[PDB]
């Protein structure tokens, strides 16, 4: 990908606990590890995602 994900980007992510997709924002990126932390919109919980697993915001 030419464009890089950055902190503050809106995305969708698969929640580890149920396998369903939810809207999220990137809070941090580990440039070497190609991982990030996402904050789930409305729930407010956060968890690690590989950058390669982030989706553009669903149904937007
Ligand atoms: C029920 C529920 C509880 C959560 N704490 C949560 C967090 C992040 C994304 C989805 C989530 N859902 C669906
Ligand atoms: C739908 C979509 C897919 C992409 N891979 C992407 C990449 C970079 C910027 C916008 C993007 N959008 C909007």
């Amino acid at each position: 990908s030419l464009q890089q994900w950055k902190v503050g980007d809106k995305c969708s992510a698969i929640w580890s606990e149920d396998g369903c997709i939810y809207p999220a924002t990137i809070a941090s990126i580990d440039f070497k590890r190609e991982t990030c932390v996402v904050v789930y919109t409305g729930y407010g919980n956060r968890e690690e995602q590989n950058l390669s697993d982030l989706l553009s915001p669903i149904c937007e």
Side-chain angles (χ1 to χ4, degrees), residues 1-30 34-60:
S1 169
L2 184 57
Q3 188 170 327
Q4 307 307 301
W5 288 109
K6 63 183 285 287
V7 166
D9 278 346
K10 303 301 175 186
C11 60
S12 289
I14 288 184
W15 190 39
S16 54
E17 298 292 347
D18 67 0
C20 295
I21 293 168
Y22 298 86
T25 313
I26 299 189
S28 64
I29 291 177
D30 188 315
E34 310 197 347
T35 66
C36 66
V37 172
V38 302
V39 178
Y40 290 103
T41 308
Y43 302 95
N45 306 117
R46 68 175 64 206
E47 69 184 348
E48 181 187 289
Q49 289 285 349
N50 304 304
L51 285 176
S52 56
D53 291 331
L54 292 186
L55 299 169
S56 37
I58 294 305
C59 203
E60 279 321 324

